[PDB]
C-alpha cells in the first residue's frame, strides 16, 4: 500500500510540479491580456478573443 | 470419472516468485514497464496535463462572452431609458397573425 | 544491441501515432470539400486582406 | 472523427504485431494516448456544435461520452490481465481485438450525424459484446446471459429500423442537423402512437427500463470484468443518448406517451433499489444499482426540460465511472476467493486497509454525496421532476434513503466485522489493482472542479 | 452454495401460476403503477388547468 | 474589510492544512495529534479577530470568491456568510474542539489509528464550518451531508463490533429521511424564487412558505434528533467518547436547529410552522428527559440530556426567539 | 425499374453512353476498401491452410489484391452509371411533366401559423 | 466441486425424497 | 475601474468617524496597524513587481462582435441555410438574456446584504427591476422545453399576441 502511494505521488508530481511552475512564470512574466476595442479595419484572429496566455495558445494551435 | 479431464489448477500467488511484483506480469522486467506506462501515461500525462488543458479551455461554450455582452446591453439600454429586456423576442412589425 | 532487436520489436510504436497524423490529414482534406460558403455567410463575410487569399483552410 | 477512428483501428495491428509479452503494455500505452487526444473534442461553441463532415459531428452531449468511452479501454485492459494470464496467446489477442472493435463502433456511434448510420453502429456493438460474455465469462449462465442480452435488444431495435426508414421516406432525410430544422409536430393518431413506441422501445430496453431489465442482471453479472465495465459504463448510455436525439422528432406526442414510462421508472427506482437490500451476490447487487440509477435518466429525458437534460448527461457520466469502479472493486475480491457471494469474505478492512478506502469512496459516490457529480446530476433531476409534479419528491426521496442503505450495507458486509477464519489467501493489494481504482475515482472527483463539461448541450 | 442457489436459480422452476401467486403479482406489480399514474395525471391535469386560466403563481419561475 | 475578510478565511484554510500535509506526506508521524491540536488553537485566535470587529461595530460581509457553475439563470458561487451566526459559533466550536482534541490525545493514546482519528475529527470540523458559513443552500448541503458521513465513520470507529456498524448505519438512515425535507426546500426555492442564495430568498420573502419550511423542519427533525427521528442520537454513543463530546453533544446535533435559525426571516412571518416546531420540540424535551430518569449507562444519560436541550432549542424557535435558540447553542 | 429503359442496350455491362461519365479515380476510397478485402482474403487463405499468415505466398496475396481491385473498378463504373441513368430519367420525366411537379408557394415563418405546445 | 445431486430441488412428495432432502441439508428427517 | 459602475452600482460609502468614550485601548486599532505592516505591505511589493513585468509585455484581447442577420420570421419554410443563421443568432441572444437576468439578480442580492435590517424598504427599486426582467424573460423563454428553438419561441410569441388581441376586443366591448 505504501509503495503504491509513493508511486502515485511521484508520477503526479513528475508533471504536476513542472506544470505548476510553468503556470506561475507565465502569469508573472507574460501576464494576461488587456481588454481593448477592435482597431478600425483590423480583423482579429479567432485566438485573439481570449484573455489568458494558455487559452490563446490552445485555440491557436489545436482548435 | 466420466472423462479424462485435467484437475482444477490451484491459483498461483504472484508474490511467491516475485515479492516486488506489481501484479501486471510474471516477468519482472515486463512487470515493471507495464507499471511505468500506466502511471506515466495515466497519471503524469492524461490526468495532470488533461486537467490543465481543461482548466484553460478557450471560453467553453462562450459563457464569459455572454456575460461581457450582457454588460454592454444593460449599460446601453439603461443609459437610453430602454427596457432592460423586452417581452417580445421578435419585433412584431414583421409577424402576420392568422386572422 | 544497435539498430537490431531494438528496431524489430519497437517499430510498432509508430502505428498509432502515425494513424493520428494520417487521420488528422484526412480531416483537413475533408474541409477542402466543404468550402461552398467560405467567406460567404451573412455573419462572417468580409473583404479579404491584401495578402490573405482565403479566410480559412 | 478520422483522427480518432484511424488510431483506434491501428491498435489492432499493434496488438497482433507486438511481442508476445508486450501485448498488454503496448495496447495499454497507446490506448491512453488516444484518450489524451480525445480532449480536443472539447472545442465546443455556445450556438453551433462541431460538424466535422457529412458523416460525423460532435456536440456537448456526445463529447463527454466520447471521452469516457476512450478512457475506459485502457482501464479494461488493466482489469483483464490477471484472469487472462493462463490463456492462449492468440486468444488473448482476440479478446483485445473485441475490445478495440467495441471502442471503434462506440466512437462512431456517438458522433454519427445520420440516424441510420447511428442505427448500424448502435447495433454493431452487440457482436463484440456478445462474444466477450459468452467466450470469456466464467460460469455456465454466460450462454443464457448472451441470449437474453441479444434478443432483448433486437426485439426493440428492429421496429426502430422500420420507424427510421419510414421517417426518411416522409421527411426526406435522417441527418440530425436537417431534422432540427425540418422537424414537424406529431399529430395525435394511432399511427403516430406506434411510431413513438418504435422510436423509443429500443433505447428503453437498453437503458434498461424497469420491466425490460431482466437481461441486465444476467449479462452484467456473467460477463468478464472488462465486459461488465463497458456494459454498465458506456453501453447503457447508448439508450439514453438515443432518446436525447430521437425525442427531437416526437413532439408533442411525448407529453402524454411518457406517462407509462415515467411511472415504470419512478416505481422501478424503488423496486430495484430494494432488491439490492437482499442480494446475496455482490456483483448482482451492483448490477441492480445501475437499473435504479438509469431510472432517473429515463424520467429526466422524458419530461424534456433544460434542467432534466443537464442532470441526465451528468448522471450518465457520473454513473459510468462509479459502476465501473464498483465492478473492479468486486472483481478484486473475486480474484482472491473465486466466489461472488457477498457474505463469504468479511472483515476485509483488517486485511486490505487501502482497498477499503476505495470501497468507501466508491460507496460515497454511489449514494450521491455532495458535491460529487453523482449528486449534481441526481439533484438536477430531482429539481426538474419537482416542477413536473411536486408529488414526485416523495418517490425521489424514498430512493435516496434506500440507496444509502444498500450502498453502506455492501461496504459494511464485505469490509467491516470479523474476518472469515478459513480464508487465508487474501494477498496484499497489487499495484495494478490500486492504480485501477485511482484511475476511476480521481477523474470522478476532479470533474467536480469543472462540472460544466459534462452538463450537455443545454448548458 | 445451496442458499444462494435456492434464492436465485431455484425460484422459477418451483413456481406455479396459481391464484395465490397471480393475485400477489397483480396487486404488487401492477397496482402501484396504476395508483401512481392517477396521482400524477390528476396532479398535472389540475396544474395545467390553473396555468391556462392564469391563476397559478409563476412570477419568478424561470427555471424548469 | 481588508482584515475582516482575510482573517475570516485564514481560519477555514488553517484547518485544512493538516489534511493536505497528510496527503502528500509533507509531515512527520507521531506528532500529528499535537499538530492537529495546534491548528485548532491558532484557528481559534484568528477567528476571534473578526468576532471582535463584529462586537465593536456589528460588521458583517459576504464573500463570493469563486464562480463555480452557472445553470442558465442560476449562478452558483462559493460564498461565505460572515454574520451574527458565524462570528459567534466558529470561536465557540474551535474553543470546544480545542479541548476535545487535547483530551483525545490522552483518551485515545493507545489506539493504533490515533492519526486517522485526528484526521476524521478535523474533517468533521471543516464540514461543520462549511455548513455554518454557507450563504447558499447547495454549499449548505455539502457540509450538511459531510457531517453525516464523518459521523458515520466515527460512530463505527471500532468497526469489528457489530453494534458499532448498526449504530453507524442507523444515524445515516434517520438523517437521510431528514434530507428529504432539505431536498424539498431546495426544489421549492428554485421553482418559486429562482435562487438558492439566502439573500434573494429573504429579499423576495415568500408569503406562501408552508411547503419549504415544512421541509426545513423535517430536515431539522432528523439531524437534531427530534421526536420521530430521535433514536439515532442515543445509539451514537457506540463511538469513542471524544466523538460523542464533539459531534453528538455540542457541535453536530445543533445543525438542525442552526438551519432553522438561518431561516428566521421566513419563520417569523409563518405562525403555522411556529405551532409545529413548538409542539415538535415540546414533546422531544419531555420524552427524552423522561427516558434519562432511569438509564444506567453514563453516556446514554448525557446523550438523552442533549436531546432534551435540543428540544428546548426548538421550543425556542417555536416561540419566535431565534436569537435565544442560538445563544443556547453556544452556551 | 429500369429494365425496359428505352435506351437500355440490353445485356451490356457498360453501354457506350457510360463513357460520358468520369471514371472512378484510382485512389477512390471505395476502390481501396475493395483492395483491402482482397488482402483479408489472402490472409485467410494462409490461415485455413496453416501457413505463416503474413509472410507465406506473397505472390498469391498480390494476386488476391489485384483481382479484387480489377473487378471492383468495373463494378464501380457500372454503379456510377446506373445512378447517372436514374437521375437522367428522373429529371427528363419532370421536365416533360411540369404540371406534376409545380413549385409550391413558399412562405415565411412570420406568416405561417404553427401551434405552440408548452413543455411544463 | 458440487453436483446437481446436492443442490436444492423441487418440493418433496414421497417419503423417500423427504429423507433424501434431509440427508442433503444435513438435518435429521424429523427436523426437516 | 476594474468593472463598470453603471452596470454594478455601489451607493456612496458613509463611514461613521471614531468617537471613543473609554480609556482602554481598542484592540482592532492595534491589530489593523499590525496587519498593514505585516500583511498589506509585503503583498503590495509582490504585486507591484508582478505588475511591472506585465507592462514590459503588454498585449491585447478583443470582444467578439456579431453583426445582425435576418431572424427566423424572415426565413422561408424548410430553408435550412437561412434558418441556420437565424437559429444560431437566437441561441446567442438566449444566452445573453440569461446573463442579463443574472446581473439584475446580483443587484438584488447585493442590495439586500448592503442595506442590512432596512433592506425591505431600501431595496424596493432593485426588487422592481428584478420583477420586470423576470417577466420579460419568462415570456420569451419559458415552457419551450429541452428542444427549444427559434421556431418554438416564435410560435409562443404568436400565441401570446393572439391572446392579447383577443383581449383588446373584449376590453373595448362596452
Ligand atoms: C491547485 C494546485 C495547482 C496550482 C497550479 C499553480 C497555480 C499557482 C501559481 C499561479 O497561478 O500564479 C500565481 C500568481 C499569478 O499572477 P496573477 O496575476 O495573480 O494571476 C494571473 C491570472 O489573473 C490568474 O491566473 P490563473 O487563471 O492561471 O489561475 C491560477 C490558478 C489558481 O488556482 C490556484 O492554485 C490558487 C487559487 C487559490 C488562491 C488561494 C485562495 C484560497 C481560498 C480559500 C477559501 C477558503 C477555503 C476554506 C474551506 O488556477 C490554475 O492554475 C488552475 C489550473 C491548474 C490546476 C489544474 C486542475 C487541478 C487542480 C488541483 C486538483 C487537486 O503569481 C503569484 O505568485 C502572486 C504572488 C502570490 C503570493 C503572495 C505572497 C505575498 C507575501 C510576500 C512576502 C514576501 C515579500 C518579499 C518581497
Ligand atoms: C515562451 C513564451 C514566448 C512568448 O513570449 O509568447 C507570448 C505569448 C503571448 O500571447 P500571444 O498569443 O498574444 O502571442 C503572440 C502571438 N504569436 C505567438 C502567435 C505571435 O504567449 C505564449 O506564447 C506563451 C504562453 C502560451 C504557450 C505556453 C503554454 C503551454 C502550456 C504549458 C503549461 C505549463 C507548463 C509549461
Ligand atoms: C482540493 C482542490 C482545491 C482547489 C484547487 C484550486 C484549483 C481548482 O480547483 O480549480 C482549477 C480548475 C478549475 O478552476 P476554474 O474553472 O475556476 O478556473 C481555472 C483557470 N481560469 C480562471 C483561467 C479558467 O480545475 C479544473 O478545471 C479541473 C478540470 C477537471 C479535469 C477532469 C478531466 C481530467 C482527466 C481527463 C479525462 C479522463 C477521464 C474521463 C472521464 C470522463 C470525462 C467526461
Ligand atoms: C451464369 C448464371 C449464373 C448467374 C445468374 C445467377 C445470379 C442472378 C443475378 C444475375 C446478375 C445480376 C443481373 C444484372 C447483371 O449485372 O448482369 C447482366 C449485365 C447487365 O445487363 P442487363 O441490363 O441486360 O441485365 C439483365 C438482367 N436483369 C434483368 C436482372 C437486369 O450484363 C452484363 O454485364 C454481361 C454482358 C456481357 C456478357 C459477357
Ligand atoms: C422492445 C422489446 C420489448 C419486448 C422484449 C421481450 C423479451 C424478448 C423475448 C425473449 C428473448 C428470448 C430469451 C432467450 C430464450 C431462451 O434462451 O430459451 C432457452 C430454451 C432452453 O432450451 P435450449 O437452450 O434450446 O436447449 C439447450 C440448453 N442448453 O430454449 C427454448 O425453449 C427455445 C426458444 C426459442 C425461441 C427463442 C428465440 C426467439 C426469440 C424472439 C421471439 C421470436 C419472434 C416472435 C415470433 C414471431 C411470430 C411467429
Ligand atoms: C408484445 C407484442 C406487441 C406487438 C405490438 C405490435 C404492434 C403493431 C402495430 C402495427 C403498425 C402500425 C402501422 O402500420 O404504422 C402506422 C402507419 C401505417 O400507415 P401509413 O401509411 O404509414 O400512414 C401514414 C403514411 N404517410 O405508419 C406510420 O405512420 C409510421 C409507423 C412506423 C412505426 C414502426 C413500425 C410499426 C410499429 C412497430 C411496432 C411498434 C411497437 C414496438 C414494440 C417493440 C417491442
Ligand atoms: C413489464 C413490461 C414493461 C414494458 C411495458 C411496455 C410499455 C407500455 C406500453 C405502452 C403504452 C402506451 C399507450 C398506448 C395507447 C394509446 C395511448 C393514448 O393514446 O392516450 C391518449 C390519452 C389522451 O391524452 P390526455 O391524457 O387526455 O391529455 C392530452 C390530450 N391531448 O392520454 C392518455 O391516455 C395518457 C397516456 C396513455 C395512458 C397511460 C396509462 C398508464 C397506466 C399505468 C401504466 C403502468 C405500466 C403498465 C405496464 C404493465 C407491465
Ligand atoms: C391481471 C388481472 C387478473 C388477476 C387474477 C389472475 C387470474 C386468476 O386469479 O386466476 C388464477 C389462475 C388459475 O389458477 P388455479 O385455478 O388456482 O390453478 C391452475 C393454475 N394454472 O391462475 C393461472 O393459472 C394463470 C394466471 C395468469 C395470470 C397472469 C396475470 C397476473 C400476473 C401478474 C401481473 C404481471 C406482473 C406485472 C409486473 C410489472 C411490473 C413489475
Ligand atoms: C456553491 C458550492 C460550491 C461547491 C464547490 C465545489 C468544491 C470545490 C472545492 C473547493 C475549491 C476551492 C477553490 C478556491 C480557489 C478558487 C479557484 C481559483 O482560484 O480559480 C481562479 C480564480 C477563479 O476565477 P473565476 O473567473 O471566478 O472562475 C470561473 C470558473 N468558472 O481566479 C483567479 O485568477 C485567482 C487565481 C490567481 C491568484 C492566485 C494567487 C495565489 C497563488 C499562490 C498560492 C498558490
Ligand atoms: C459479390 C460480387 C461478386 C462479383 C463477381 C464478379 C462479377 C463481376 C465481374 C466484373 C469484372 C469485369 C471485367 C472487365 C469487363 C470488361 O472488360 O468488359 C468486357 C465485358 C463485356 O463488356 P460490354 O459491356 O458487353 O461492352 C459492350 C460495349 N458495347 O465485360 C463483361 O462481360 C463483364 C461481365 C461480368 C459478369 C456480369 C456481372 C455483373 C453483375 C455483378 C454481379 C455481382 C453484384 C454484387 C452486388 C452486391 C451489392 C453489395
Ligand atoms: C520519459 C520520462 O519522463 O521518464 C519518466 C518515467 C519513469 O521514471 P523513472 O526515472 O524510471 O522513475 C520512475 C519509476 N520507478 C519509481 C520505478 C523508478 O518514464 C516512464 O517510465 C515512461 C514510460 C516509458 C516510455 C516513455 C516514452 C515517452 C514518449
Ligand atoms: Zn483468480
How far apart CA G35 and CA G24 sit, in angstroms, is 14
Q: What single string gives the DSSP state of each residue in G44-96?
A: HHHHHTT--TTTTTHHHHHHHHHHHHHHHHHHHHHHHHHHHHHHHHHHHHHHH
How far apart CA D93 and CA D22 sit, in angstroms, is 11
Question: Technique behind this structure?
Answer: cryo-EM
User: Contacts of residue A28 in chain I, CB cutoff 8 Å?
Assistant: 50, 53
- Give CA D390 to chain center in angstroms: 29
Q: Which residues are within 8 A (CB) of F163 and not within 5 positions of it... i.e. 6 or more apart?
A: F238
Residue of B46, F55, I89, E4 whose CA lies nearest to D339: E4
E34 Cβ below 6 A of ligand 8:
no
Q: How far A50 CA lies from chain B's nearest CA (Å)?
A: 6
CB of F167 closer than 8 Å to CB of F238? yes
How far apart CA F291 and CA F282 sit, in angstroms, is 14
Does E57 reach chain F within 8 Å, measured CB to CB? yes
User: What are the percentages of helix, strand and coil residues in chain F, rounded to 5?
Assistant: 75, 5, 20
Closest residue (by CA) to atom 28 of ligand 4?
Answer: G3
For chain B, how many helices (H) and strands (E)? 3, 0
How far apart CA G36 and CA D12 sit, in angstroms, is 15
How far apart CA D395 and CA D380 sit, in angstroms, is 15
**Helices I124-141 + I150-171 axis angle, to 10:** 110
How far apart CA F298 and CA D79 sit, in angstroms, is 51
Q: Which residues are within 8 A (CB) of F307 and not within 5 positions of it... i.e. 6 or more apart?
A: F225, F230, F233, F234, F253, F284, F285, F288
Could you give the angle at the alpha carbon of E38 between the alpha carbons of E33 and E39, nearest 5°? 95
User: Contacts of residue B98 in chain G, CB cutoff 8 Å?
Assistant: 113
Residue F295, number of CB atoms within 10 A of its CB: 15
Strand pairing category for F61-71 and F74-82:
antiparallel
C-alpha cell at A35: 481588454
How far apart CA F76 and CA D122 sit, in angstroms, is 37
Could you give the angle at the alpha carbon of D185 between the alpha carbons of D179 and D187, nearest 5°? 135
What residue has cell string 407509462? D260
Phi/psi at F2 (nearest 5 deg)? -55, -35
Q: Which residues are within 8 A (CB) of C44 and not within 5 positions of it... i.e. 6 or more apart?
A: C55
How far apart CA F46 and CA F40 sit, in angstroms, is 10
Residue I4, number of CB atoms within 10 A of its CB: 12
E16 Cα–ligand 5 center, Å: 20
How far apart CA G51 and CA G54 sit, in angstroms, is 9
Beta partners for residue F79, in sequence order:
F64
C-alpha cell at D155: 426485439
How far apart CA F85 and CA F96 sit, in angstroms, is 17
Q: Which of F180-218 are b and which e, b meaning 16 or more Cβ less than 10 Å from the residue's Cβ?
A: bbbbbbbbbbbbbbbbbbbbbbbbbebeebeebbbbbbb
How far apart CA B70 and CA I96 sit, in angstroms, is 5
C-alpha cell at E25: 403479482
> What would you report as the CA-atom Rg of chain B, rounded to the nearest whole angstrom?
33
How far apart CA F117 and CA F18 sit, in angstroms, is 13
How far apart CA B20 and CA B31 sit, in angstroms, is 10
- Closest-CA residue of D relative to I91 is D47
Does G117 reach chain E within 8 Å, measured CB to CB? no
C-alpha cell at F207: 408569503
HEC string of chain D? CHHHHHHHHHHHHHHHHCCHHHHHHHHHHHHHHHHHHHHHHHCCCCCCCEECCCCEEECCCHHHHHHHHHHHHHHHHHHHCCCCCCCCHHHHHHHHHHHHHHHHHHHHHHHECEHHHHHHHHHHCHHHHHHHHHHHCCCCCHHHHHHHHHHHHHHHHHHHHHHHHHHHHHHCCCEHHHHHHHCCCCCCCHHHHHHHHHHHHHHHHHCCCCCCCCHHHHHHHHCCHHHHHHHHHHHCHHHHHHHHHHHHHCCCCHHHHCHHHHHHHHHHHHHHHHHHHHCCEHHHHHHHHHHHHHHHHHHHHHHCCHHHHHHHHHHHHHHHHHHHHHHHHHHHHHHHHCCCECCCCCCCCCCCHHHHHHHHHHHHHHCCCCCCHHHHHHHHHHHHHHHHCCCHHHHHHHHHHHHHHHHHHHHHHHHCCCCCCCCCCCCCCCHHHHHHHHHHHHHHHHHHHCHHHHCCCCC
CB of F256 closer than 8 Å to CB of F223? yes
CB of F149 closer than 8 Å to CB of F89? no
Q: Which ligand 5 atom is at minimum distance from the Cα of D214? A: 7
> What would you report as the CA-atom Rg of chain A, rounded to the nearest whole angstrom?
18
How far apart CA G98 and CA G106 sit, in angstroms, is 18
What residue has cell string 488510431? D7
Judged on CB neighbours under 10 Å (0-12, 13-18, 19+), H3 is: exposed
Q: Which of D167, D194, D215 has most ligand 6 atoms within 8 Å of its beta carbon, as the pocket-test mutant?
A: D194
What residue has cell string 444498500? D406
Residue of D390, D229, D383, D245 whose CA lies nearest to D319: D229
C-alpha cell at G4: 425496359
Q: Which residues are within 8 A (CB) of F33 and not within 5 positions of it... i.e. 6 or more apart?
A: F101, F104, F105, F114, F115, F118
Residue of D114, D121, D129, D115 whose CA lies nearest to D5: D121
CB of D298 closer than 8 Å to CB of D312? no
Q: Provide the chain E residues 2-61 that lie in CB contact (below 8 A) with chain G.
A: 47-48, 51
G54 Cβ below 6 A of ligand 10:
no
How far apart CA I167 and CA I161 sit, in angstroms, is 10
C-alpha cell at C47: 473583404
- Closest-CA residue of G relative to B99 is G113
Residue D312, number of CB atoms within 10 A of its CB: 32
How far apart CA D346 and CA D356 sit, in angstroms, is 12
C-alpha cell at B96: 402576420
Amino acid at each position: 500500500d505504501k509503495r503504491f502511494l509513493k508511486l502515485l505521488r511521484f508520477y503526479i508530481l513528475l508533471t504536476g510540479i513542472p506544470v505548476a511552475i510553468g503556470i506561475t512564470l507565465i502569469n508573472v512574466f507574460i501576464g494576461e491580456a488587456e481588454l481593448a476595442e477592435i482597431p478600425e479595419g483590423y480583423v482579429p484572429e479567432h485566438w485573439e478573443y481570449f484573455k489568458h496566455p494558455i487559452s490563446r495558445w490552445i485555440a491557436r494551435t489545436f482548435f | 470419472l466420466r472423462w479424462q479431464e485435467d484437475p482444477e489448477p490451484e491459483d498461483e500467488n504472484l508474490y511467491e516468485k516475485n515479492p516486488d511484483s506489481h501484479g501486471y506480469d510474471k516477468d519482472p522486467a515486463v512487470d515493471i514497464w507495464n507499471m511505468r506506462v500506466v502511471f506515466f501515461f495515466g497519471f503524469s500525462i492524461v490526468l495532470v496535463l488533461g486537467s490543465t488543458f481543461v482548466a484553460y479551455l478557450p471560453d467553453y461554450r462562450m459563457q464569459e462572452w455572454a456575460r461581457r455582452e450582457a454588460e454592454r446591453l444593460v449599460k446601453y439600454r439603461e443609459a437610453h431609458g430602454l427596457p432592460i429586456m423586452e417581452s417580445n423576442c421578435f419585433d412584431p412589425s414583421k409577424i402576420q397573425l392568422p386572422e | 544491441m544497435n539498430l537490431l532487436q531494438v528496431v524489430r520489436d519497437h517499430w510498432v510504436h509508430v502505428l498509432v501515432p502515425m494513424g493520428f497524423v494520417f487521420g488528422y490529414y484526412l480531416d483537413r482534406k475533408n474541409d477542402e470539400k466543404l468550402t461552398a460558403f467560405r467567406n460567404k455567410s451573412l455573419l462572417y463575410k468580409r473583404e479579404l486582406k491584401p495578402n490573405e487569399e482565403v479566410t480559412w483552410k | 472523427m478520422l483522427k480518432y477512428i484511424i488510431p483506434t483501428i491501428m491498435l489492432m495491428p499493434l496488438t497482433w504485431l507486438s511481442k508476445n509479452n508486450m501485448i498488454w503494455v503496448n495496447s495499454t500505452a497507446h490506448s491512453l494516448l488516444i484518450s489524451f487526444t480525445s480532449l480536443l473534442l472539447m472545442n465546443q461553441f455556445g450556438d453551433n456544435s462541431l460538424n466535422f463532415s457529412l458523416l460525423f459531428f460532435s456536440d456537448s452531449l456526445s463529447t463527454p461520452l466520447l471521452i469516457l468511452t476512450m478512457w475506459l479501454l485502457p482501464l479494461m485492459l488493466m482489469a483483464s490481465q490477471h484472469h487472462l494470464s493462463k490463456e492462449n496467446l492468440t486468444r488473448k489477442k482476440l479478446f483485445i481485438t473485441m475490445l478495440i472493435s467495441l471502442q471503434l463502433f462506440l466512437i462512431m456511434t456517438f458522433t454519427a450525424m445520420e440516424l441510420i448510420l447511428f442505427y448500424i453502429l448502435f447495433e454493431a456493438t452487440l457482436v463484440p459484446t456478445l462474444i466477450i460474455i459468452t467466450r470469456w465469462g466464467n460460469q455456465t449462465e454466460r450462454l443464457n446471459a448472451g441470449l437474453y442480452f441479444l434478443f432483448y435488444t433486437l426485439a426493440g431495435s428492429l421496429p426502430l429500423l422500420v420507424a427510421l426508414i419510414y421517417i426518411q421516406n416522409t421527411v426526406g432525410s435522417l441527418n440530425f442537423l436537417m431534422l432540427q430544422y425540418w422537424v414537424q409536430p406529431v399529430h395525435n393518431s394511432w399511427s403516430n402512437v406506434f411510431m413513438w413506441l418504435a422510436c423509443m422501445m429500443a433505447f428503453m430496453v437498453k437503458m434498461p427500463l424497469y420491466g425490460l431489465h431482466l437481461w441486465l442482471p444476467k449479462a452484467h453479472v456473467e460477463a468478464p470484468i472488462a465486459g461488465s465495465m463497458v456494459l454498465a459504463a458506456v453501453l447503457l448510455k447508448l439508450g439514453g443518448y438515443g432518446m436525447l436525439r430521437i425525442t427531437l422528432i416526437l413532439n408533442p406526442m411525448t407529453d402524454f406517451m411518457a406517462y407509462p414510462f415515467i411511472m415504470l421508472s419512478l416505481w422501478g427506482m424503488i423496486m430495484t433499489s430494494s432488491i439490492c437490500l437482499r442480494q446475496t451476490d455482490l456483483k448482482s447487487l451492483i448490477a441492480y444499482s445501475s437499473v435504479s440509477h438509469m431510472a432517473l435518466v429515463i424520467v429526466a429525458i422524458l419530461i424534456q426540460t433544460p434542467w432534466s437534460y443537464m442532470g441526465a448527461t451528468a448522471l450518465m457520466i457520473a454513473h459510468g465511472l462509479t459502476s465501473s469502479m464498483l465492478f473492479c472493486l468486486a472483481n478484486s475480491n473475486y480474484e482472491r476467493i473465486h466466489s461472488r457471494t457477498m457474505i463469504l469474505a468479511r472483515g476485509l478492512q483488517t486485511l486490505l486497509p487501502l482497498m477499503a478506502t476505495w470501497w468507501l469512496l466508491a460507496s460515497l459516490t454511489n449514494l450521491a454525496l455532495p458535491p460529487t457529480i453523482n449528486l449534481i446530476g441526481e439533484l438536477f433531476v430531482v429539481m426538474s421532476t419537482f416542477s413536473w409534479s411536486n408529488i414526485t419528491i416523495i418517490l425521489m426521496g424514498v430512493n435516496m434513503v434506500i440507496t444509502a442503505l444498500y450502498s453502506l450495507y455492501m461496504l459494511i458486509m464485505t469490509q467491516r466485522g470479523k474476518y472469515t477464519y478459513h480464508i487465508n489467501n487474501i494477498s496484499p493489494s497489487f499495484t495494478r489493482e490500486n492504480a485501477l481504482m485511482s484511475l476511476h475515482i480521481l477523474p470522478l472527483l476532479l470533474l467536480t472542479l469543472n462540472p460544466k463539461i459534462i452538463l450537455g448541450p443545454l448548458y | 452454495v445451496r442458499w444462494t442457489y435456492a434464492r436465485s436459480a431455484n425460484i422459477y422452476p418451483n413456481f406455479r401460476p396459481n391464484t395465490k401467486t397471480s393475485l400477489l403479482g397483480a396487486l404488487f406489480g401492477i397496482g402501484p403503477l396504476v395508483f401512481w399514474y392517477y396521482v400524477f395525471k390528476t396532479d398535472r391535469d389540475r396544474k395545467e388547468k390553473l396555468i391556462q386560466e392564469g391563476k397559478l403563481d409563476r412570477t419568478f419561475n424561470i427555471s424548469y | 474589510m481588508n482584515m475582516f475578510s482575510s482573517l475570516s478565511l485564514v481560519t477555514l484554510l488553517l484547518l485544512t492544512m493538516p489534511i493536505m500535509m497528510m496527503s502528500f506526506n509533507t509531515y512527520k508521524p507521531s506528532n500529528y495529534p499535537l499538530y492537529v491540536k495546534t491548528a485548532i488553537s491558532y484557528a481559534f485566535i484568528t477567528s476571534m479577530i473578526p468576532t471582535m470587529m463584529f462586537i465593536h461595530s456589528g460588521q458583517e460581509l459576504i464573500i463570493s470568491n469563486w464562480h463555480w457553475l452557472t445553470i442558465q439563470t442560476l449562478k452558483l458561487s462559493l460564498s461565505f456568510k460572515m454574520d451574527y451566526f458565524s462570528m459567534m459559533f466558529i470561536p465557540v466550536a474551535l474553543f470546544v474542539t480545542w479541548s476535545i482534541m487535547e483530551f483525545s490525545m490522552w483518551y485515545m493514546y493507545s489506539d493504533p489509528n490515533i492519526n486517522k482519528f485526528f484526521k476524521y475529527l478535523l474533517l468533521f470540523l471543516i464540514t461543520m464550518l462549511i455548513l455554518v458559513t454557507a450563504n447558499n443552500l447547495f454549499q449548505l448541503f455539502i457540509g450538511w451531508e459531510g457531517v453525516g458521513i464523518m459521523s458515520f465513520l466515527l460512530i463505527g470507529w471500532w468497526y469489528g463490533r457489530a453494534d458499532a456498524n448498526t449504530a453507524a448505519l442507523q444515524a445515516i438512515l434517520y438523517n437521510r429521511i431528514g434530507d428529504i425535507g432539505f431536498i424539498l426546500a431546495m426544489a421549492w426555492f428554485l421553482t418559486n424564487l429562482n435562487t438558492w442564495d439566502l439573500q434573494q430568498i429573504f429579499m423576495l420573502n415568500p408569503s406562501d412558505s408552508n411547503m419549504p419550511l415544512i421541509g426545513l423542519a423535517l430536515a431539522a427533525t432528523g439531524k437534531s434528533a427530534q421526536f420521530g427521528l430521535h433514536p439515532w442520537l442515543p445509539s451514537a454513543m457506540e463511538g469513542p467518547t471524544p466523538v460523542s463530546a464533539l459531534l453528538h453533544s455540542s457541535t453536530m446535533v445543533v445543525a438542525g436547529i442552526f438551519l432553522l435559525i438561518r431561516f428566521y426571516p421566513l419563520t417569523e412571518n409563518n405562525k403555522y410552522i411556529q405551532s409545529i416546531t413548538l409542539c415538535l420540540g415540546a414533546i422531544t424535551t419531555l420524552f427524552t428527559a423522561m427516558c434519562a430518569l432511569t438509564q444506567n449507562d453514563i453516556k446514554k444519560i448525557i446523550a438523552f440530556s442533549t436531546s432534551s436541550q435540543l428540544g428546548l432549542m426548538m421550543v425556542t424557535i417555536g416561540i419566535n426567539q431565534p436569537y435565544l435558540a442560538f445563544l443556547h447553542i453556544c452556551t | 425499374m429500369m429494365t425496359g429503359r428505352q435506351g437500355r442496350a440490353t445485356f451490356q455491362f457498360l453501354p457506350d453512353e457510360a463513357r460520358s461519365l468520369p471514371p472512378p479515380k484510382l485512389t477512390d476510397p471505395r476502390l481501396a476498401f475493395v483492395g483491402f478485402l482482397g488482402y483479408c482474403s489472402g490472409l485467410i487463405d494462409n490461415a485455413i491452410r496453416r501457413r505463416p499468415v503474413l509472410l507465406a505466398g506473397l505472390h498469391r496475396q498480390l494476386l488476391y489484391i489485384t483481382s479484387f481491385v480489377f473487378v471492383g473498378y468495373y463494378l464501380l463504373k457500372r454503379q456510377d452509371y446506373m445512378y447517372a441513368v436514374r437521375d437522367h430519367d428522373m429529371f427528363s420525366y419532370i421536365k416533360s411533366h411540369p404540371e406534376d411537379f409545380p413549385e409550391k408557394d413558399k412562405k415565411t415563418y412570420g406568416e405561417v401559423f404553427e401551434e405552440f405546445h408548452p413543455v411544463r | 466441486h458440487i453436483t446437481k445431486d446436492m443442490l436444492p430441488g423441487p418440493y418433496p412428495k414421497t417419503p423417500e425424497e423427504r429423507a433424501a432432502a434431509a440427508k442433503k441439508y444435513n438435518m435429521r428427517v424429523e427436523d426437516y | 475601474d476594474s468593472w463598470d459602475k453603471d452596470v454594478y452600482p455601489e451607493p456612496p460609502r458613509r463611514t461613521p468617524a471614531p468617537s471613543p468614550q473609554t480609556s482602554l485601548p481598542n484592540p482592532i486599532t492595534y491589530l489593523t496597524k499590525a496587519f498593514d505592516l505585516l500583511v498589506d505591505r509585503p503583498v503590495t511589493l509582490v504585486r507591484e513587481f508582478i505588475e511591472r513585468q506585465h507592462a514590459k509585455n503588454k498585449y491585447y484581447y478583443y470582444h467578439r462582435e456579431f453583426r445582425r442577420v435576418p431572424d427566423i420570421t424572415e426565413c422561408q419554410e424548410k430553408d435550412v441555410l437561412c434558418m441556420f443563421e437565424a437559429e444560431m443568432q437566437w441561441r446567442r441572444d438566449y444566452k445573453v438574456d440569461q446573463e442579463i437576468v443574472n446581473i439584475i439578480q446580483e443587484r438584488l442580492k447585493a442590495c439586500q446584504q448592503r442595506e442590512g435590517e432596512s433592506h425591505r424598504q431600501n431595496c424596493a427599486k432593485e426588487l422592481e427591476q428584478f420583477t420586470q426582467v423576470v417577466k420579460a424573460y419568462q415570456d420569451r423563454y419559458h415552457d419551450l422545453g429541452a428542444h427549444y428553438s427559434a421556431r418554438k419561441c416564435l410560435a409562443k410569441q404568436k400565441q401570446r399576441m393572439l391572446a392579447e388581441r383577443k383581449a383588446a376586443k373584449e376590453a373595448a366591448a362596452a
